[PDB]
Amino acid sequence: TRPDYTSFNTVDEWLEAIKMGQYKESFANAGFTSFDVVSQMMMEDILRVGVTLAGHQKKILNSIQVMRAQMNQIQSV
Amino acid sequence: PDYTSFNTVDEWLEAIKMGQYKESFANAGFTSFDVVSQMMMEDILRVGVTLAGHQKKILNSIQVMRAQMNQIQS
Amino acid sequence: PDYTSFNTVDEWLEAIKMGQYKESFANAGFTSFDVVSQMMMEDILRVGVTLAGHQKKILNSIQVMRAQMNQIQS
Amino acid sequence: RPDYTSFNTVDEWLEAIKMGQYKESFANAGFTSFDVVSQMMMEDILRVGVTLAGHQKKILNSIQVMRAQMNQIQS
């Protein structure tokens, strides 16, 4: 019935935010549609999605690491 | 840069700090975002939310959810 | 000038001086770097690490382990 | 899963002593963790392909310092 809702901001908004918007469609097609699943990505998943440039992998891996720290912060609730 | 995410109505309630109403939502049958996105004040009163501040918080969070769903469909 | 090799989850805990949690990890099923590299704070708490200093040490060490796995996959 | 056996890789060790041209020779021979590199002797450095005297010396004095460092942490 309605669009999935899993976070206040969308994965797309995040990719646009860090200037990685060129990967929106790659990420979606591959099912990495929520921060919950993006926060578990490793280099091999980013490669599979199609991020081959080192600078872009570093940027996306850095955001994934911030997502995990923020999640670990809340969990220490 | 807020990466807060949730997979269920319970976690969404904990994310907007309204976790005290988890069981009342679940008991009344509000278990999916499909239905939570359509809730009005009457439903909010039906599950026991009586503080004005909590009622606004939950309704504004429903409105924010609807806006997100509505861009998506766009 | 740090040549800390280690082949087991137990050896890694001892290397980072968190040997006191060796059994806890084991009894909860955290027996391979493959699952340890995926641990979050809920897992750290499940294996009984309550001190904030230990929690940070372990999580940062996991953060460092993932980065190395990520390089190698590069 | 890229098997984790240290906070540092043998590869970074080799680059640090400017012996990086031997990275893949070390990897192929399975000299991929420090506890194994710390046990290499001249015959292992030769099997790997290091033939220049200066490089053998650099790599062996380095392995010697590594053992001295492991032997202290062991005390």
- Contact residues for D6 (Cβ-Cβ < 8 A; gap 6+): C3, C4, C5, C6, D33, D34
Minimum-distance CB partner of C7 among D5, D69, D70:
D5
Do C47 and C25 form a contact (C-beta atoms < 8 A)? Answer: yes
- The CATH number that domain B1-74 falls under is 1.10.150.50
Experimental approach: X-ray
Q: For residues B24 and B5, what is the distance between their CA atoms, to the nearest angstrom?
A: 22
- Minimum Cα–Cα distance from C74: chain D residue: D2
Mutation pick from D1, D3, D4, D38 vs chain C, by most beta carbons of C within 10 Å, is: D4
β-partners of residue C14 are none
- Minimum Cα–Cα distance from A52: chain C residue: C74
Minimum-distance CB partner of B4 among A1, A2, A7:
A7
- Contact residues for A40 (Cβ-Cβ < 8 A; gap 6+): C38
Q: For residues B34 and D13, what is the distance between their CA atoms, to the nearest angstrom?
A: 55
CA dist D38 → D9, D31, D54 (Å): 13, 10, 19
Question: Right CATH number for A1-77 from 1.10.150.50, 1.50.10.20, 1.10.10.10, 1.10.8.60?
Answer: 1.10.150.50
CA dist A33 → B4, B61, B73 (Å): 14, 21, 15
Q: CA neighbours within 13 Å on the CB side: how many for B18? A: 26
Q: Which amino acid is located at B36 in the chain?
A: V
Q: Does domain D1-75 have CATH number 3.40.50.300?
A: no
End-to-end CA distance of chain D: 32
Three state DSSP letters for chain A: CCCCCCECCCHHHHHHHCCCHHHHHHHHHCCCCCHHHHCCCCHHHHHHHCCCCHHHHHHHHHHHHHHHHHHHHHHCC
Secondary structure class of D75 (helix, strand, coil)? coil
Do D61 and D54 form a contact (C-beta atoms < 8 A)? Answer: no
Q: Burial of B6 by CB count in 10 Å (0-12 exposed, 13-18 middle, 19+ buried)? A: buried
Token pair, residue B56, equals 């606004």
Those residues of chain B whose CB sits closer than 8 Å to some CB in chain A are 1-7, 12, 15, 33-34, 37, 64-65, 68-69, 72-73
Q: For residues D19 and B18, what is the distance between their CA atoms, to the nearest angstrom?
A: 59
Which of these, D32, D33, D38, D45, lies nearest to D69 by C-alpha position?
D38
- Minimum Cα–Cα distance from D33: chain C residue: C5
- Contact residues for C64 (Cβ-Cβ < 8 A; gap 6+): D7
Sort out which chain A residues have CB atoms less than 8 A from B6's CB and list them.
6-7
The alpha-carbon radius of gyration of chain C (Å, integer) is: 12
Q: For residues D47 and D53, what is the distance between their CA atoms, to the nearest angstrom?
A: 14
Query: Buried b / exposed e across B47-65, counting CB within 10 Å, b at 16+?
Result: bebeeeebeeebeebbeeb
